[PDB]
Amino acid sequence: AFVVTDNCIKCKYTDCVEECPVDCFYEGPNFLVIHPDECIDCALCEPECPAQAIFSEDEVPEDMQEFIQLNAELAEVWPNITEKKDPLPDAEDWDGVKGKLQHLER
């Protein structure tokens, strides 16, 4: 499975979803997550995220390992999203800012 990590938070561009043949992205107020059981590892979503926030589960940075479990868990409670939407208003301002996990909304 592929995993959405820290730089997605407060950006949430949503270009990722248009690439997904199986529709396994789930939406939060300021973050997206992939469902690990539905994802087929097609990788088609990774070169298309402007925030370079998606990684193969085995290529997820040492300092972001907690996102693997977070994607699995929130994918069970958030609604599916299959259509591209406008990025969050100040996405450029937040793209590249580290430790944005402190800003994650449920």
- Summarize the annotated binding site as residue ranges: 8, 16, 20, 39, 42, 45, 49
Beta bridge partner(s), residue 27: 32
Told to check if 45 binds ligand SF4 by CB under 6 A, we report yes
Told to check if 70 binds ligand SF4 by CB under 6 A, we report no
- Whichever of 22 and 97 has its CB closer to ligand SF4, that residue is 22
What is the C-alpha to C-alpha distance for residues 95 and 38, in angstroms, rounded to an integer? 27
What is the C-alpha to C-alpha distance for residues 103 and 51, in angstroms, rounded to an integer? 16
Find the shortest distance in angstroms from Cβ 49 to ligand F3S. Answer: 3
Q: How many residues bind ligand SF4 (CB under 6 A)?
A: 13
Q: Residues in the chain, how many? A: 106
